[PDB]
Short mmCIF file of all heavy atoms in Angstrom, two decimals:
data_model
loop_
_atom_site.label_atom_id
_atom_site.label_comp_id
_atom_site.label_asym_id
_atom_site.label_seq_id
_atom_site.Cartn_x
_atom_site.Cartn_y
_atom_site.Cartn_z
N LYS M 1170 9.41 3.71 -16.41
CA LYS M 1170 8.62 2.48 -16.43
C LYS M 1170 9.24 1.32 -15.74
O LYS M 1170 8.56 0.41 -15.27
CB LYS M 1170 8.27 2.11 -17.83
CG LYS M 1170 7.62 0.75 -18.03
CD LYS M 1170 7.19 0.52 -19.44
CE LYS M 1170 5.96 1.26 -19.82
NZ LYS M 1170 5.60 1.18 -21.22
N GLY M 1382 1.20 3.05 15.68
CA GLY M 1382 1.51 1.78 15.03
C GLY M 1382 2.30 0.79 15.91
O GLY M 1382 2.32 -0.40 15.66
N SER M 1384 3.56 0.04 20.17
CA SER M 1384 3.48 0.40 21.65
C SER M 1384 4.47 -0.49 22.37
O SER M 1384 4.39 -1.72 22.38
CB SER M 1384 2.06 0.08 22.13
OG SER M 1384 1.22 1.11 21.64
N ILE M 1386 6.14 -1.71 25.81
CA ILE M 1386 5.86 -1.86 27.21
C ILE M 1386 7.03 -1.84 28.12
O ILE M 1386 8.03 -2.55 27.95
CB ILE M 1386 5.09 -3.21 27.46
CG1 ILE M 1386 3.94 -3.34 26.51
CG2 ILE M 1386 4.55 -3.27 28.90
CD1 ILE M 1386 2.93 -2.21 26.56
N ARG M 1408 4.23 -1.13 6.41
CA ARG M 1408 5.11 -1.61 7.45
C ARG M 1408 6.39 -2.11 6.85
O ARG M 1408 6.53 -2.48 5.72
CB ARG M 1408 4.44 -2.73 8.21
CG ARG M 1408 3.19 -2.27 8.99
CD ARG M 1408 3.62 -1.49 10.21
NE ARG M 1408 2.54 -1.00 11.02
CZ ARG M 1408 1.82 0.09 10.74
NH1 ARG M 1408 2.13 0.81 9.63
NH2 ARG M 1408 0.88 0.50 11.55
N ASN M 1420 4.18 -9.19 -5.77
CA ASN M 1420 2.99 -9.32 -6.51
C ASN M 1420 2.33 -10.58 -6.14
O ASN M 1420 2.83 -11.70 -6.34
CB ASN M 1420 3.22 -9.36 -8.02
CG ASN M 1420 2.18 -9.95 -8.95
OD1 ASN M 1420 0.95 -9.84 -8.56
ND2 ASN M 1420 2.54 -10.58 -10.00
N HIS M 1422 0.23 -13.11 -6.95
CA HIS M 1422 -0.30 -13.64 -8.17
C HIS M 1422 -1.23 -14.78 -7.90
O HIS M 1422 -0.83 -15.85 -7.48
CB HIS M 1422 0.86 -14.09 -9.06
CG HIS M 1422 0.48 -14.49 -10.45
ND1 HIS M 1422 1.43 -14.62 -11.49
CD2 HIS M 1422 -0.67 -14.87 -10.96
CE1 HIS M 1422 0.81 -15.00 -12.58
NE2 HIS M 1422 -0.47 -15.18 -12.28
N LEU M 1423 -2.52 -14.57 -8.19
CA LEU M 1423 -3.52 -15.60 -8.01
C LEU M 1423 -3.63 -16.62 -9.13
O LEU M 1423 -3.64 -16.21 -10.27
CB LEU M 1423 -4.90 -14.95 -7.71
CG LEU M 1423 -6.11 -15.95 -7.72
CD1 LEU M 1423 -6.15 -16.72 -6.35
CD2 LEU M 1423 -7.36 -15.18 -7.92
N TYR M 1425 -6.25 -19.50 -10.24
CA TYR M 1425 -7.62 -20.11 -9.88
C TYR M 1425 -8.05 -21.15 -10.83
O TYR M 1425 -8.09 -21.00 -12.02
CB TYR M 1425 -8.67 -18.97 -9.81
CG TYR M 1425 -9.96 -19.51 -9.46
CD1 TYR M 1425 -10.30 -20.02 -8.20
CD2 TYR M 1425 -11.08 -19.42 -10.37
CE1 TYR M 1425 -11.54 -20.52 -7.82
CE2 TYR M 1425 -12.35 -19.91 -10.04
CZ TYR M 1425 -12.53 -20.49 -8.77
OH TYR M 1425 -13.82 -20.94 -8.49
N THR A 1206 9.30 -14.53 18.56
CA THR A 1206 10.47 -13.77 18.90
C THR A 1206 10.97 -14.28 20.24
O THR A 1206 10.15 -14.60 21.10
CB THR A 1206 10.21 -12.26 18.97
OG1 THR A 1206 11.41 -11.58 19.48
CG2 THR A 1206 9.09 -12.00 20.02
N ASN A 1481 1.23 -3.11 -21.11
CA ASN A 1481 1.39 -2.13 -20.04
C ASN A 1481 0.41 -2.50 -18.91
O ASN A 1481 0.39 -1.81 -17.90
CB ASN A 1481 1.03 -0.70 -20.54
CG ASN A 1481 2.11 -0.14 -21.45
OD1 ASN A 1481 3.32 -0.21 -21.14
ND2 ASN A 1481 1.69 0.48 -22.54
N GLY A 1506 -1.66 -10.01 -12.09
CA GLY A 1506 -2.18 -10.29 -10.70
C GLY A 1506 -3.01 -11.55 -10.58
O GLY A 1506 -3.01 -12.12 -9.53
N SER A 1508 -4.60 -15.35 -12.59
CA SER A 1508 -4.62 -16.29 -13.75
C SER A 1508 -5.79 -17.24 -13.55
O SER A 1508 -5.91 -17.92 -12.49
CB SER A 1508 -3.27 -17.03 -13.75
OG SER A 1508 -2.22 -16.15 -14.09
N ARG A 1532 -4.83 -4.88 -3.32
CA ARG A 1532 -5.74 -5.98 -3.66
C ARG A 1532 -7.04 -5.77 -2.95
O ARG A 1532 -7.07 -5.23 -1.85
CB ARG A 1532 -5.17 -7.32 -3.21
CG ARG A 1532 -3.94 -7.73 -4.00
CD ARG A 1532 -4.37 -8.42 -5.27
NE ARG A 1532 -3.24 -9.00 -6.04
CZ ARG A 1532 -2.38 -8.21 -6.67
NH1 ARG A 1532 -2.53 -6.85 -6.66
NH2 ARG A 1532 -1.37 -8.75 -7.38
N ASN A 1544 -4.70 -0.75 10.59
CA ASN A 1544 -3.51 -0.38 11.27
C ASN A 1544 -2.94 -1.52 12.04
O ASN A 1544 -3.51 -1.91 13.06
CB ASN A 1544 -3.75 0.81 12.21
CG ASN A 1544 -2.70 0.94 13.31
OD1 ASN A 1544 -1.53 0.55 13.10
ND2 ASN A 1544 -3.07 1.43 14.48
N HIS A 1546 -1.05 -2.57 14.62
CA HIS A 1546 -0.55 -2.03 15.83
C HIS A 1546 0.28 -3.03 16.67
O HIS A 1546 -0.29 -3.87 17.33
CB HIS A 1546 -1.76 -1.46 16.61
CG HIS A 1546 -1.43 -0.66 17.85
ND1 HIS A 1546 -2.37 0.06 18.51
CD2 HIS A 1546 -0.26 -0.51 18.46
CE1 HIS A 1546 -1.77 0.66 19.52
NE2 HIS A 1546 -0.50 0.33 19.55
N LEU A 1547 1.60 -2.86 16.65
CA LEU A 1547 2.46 -3.77 17.42
C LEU A 1547 2.53 -3.49 18.87
O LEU A 1547 2.49 -2.33 19.30
CB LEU A 1547 3.91 -3.59 16.88
CG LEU A 1547 4.97 -4.45 17.59
CD1 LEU A 1547 4.84 -5.88 17.12
CD2 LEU A 1547 6.35 -3.95 17.21
N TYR A 1549 4.75 -4.65 22.08
CA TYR A 1549 5.97 -5.39 22.39
C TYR A 1549 6.44 -5.31 23.82
O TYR A 1549 6.53 -4.23 24.39
CB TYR A 1549 7.13 -4.87 21.45
CG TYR A 1549 8.42 -5.53 21.73
CD1 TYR A 1549 8.53 -6.94 21.53
CD2 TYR A 1549 9.56 -4.87 22.23
CE1 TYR A 1549 9.70 -7.60 21.87
CE2 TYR A 1549 10.72 -5.49 22.45
CZ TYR A 1549 10.83 -6.91 22.32
OH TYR A 1549 12.01 -7.58 22.54
#
Side-chain angles (χ1 to χ4, degrees):
Chain M
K1170 171 173 286 172
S1384 288
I1386 311 302
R1408 295 288 180 277
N1420 158 30
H1422 186 165
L1423 171 78
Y1425 182 63
Chain A
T1206 174
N1481 286 316
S1508 294
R1532 292 276 182 290
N1544 158 31
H1546 188 170
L1547 179 75
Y1549 179 61

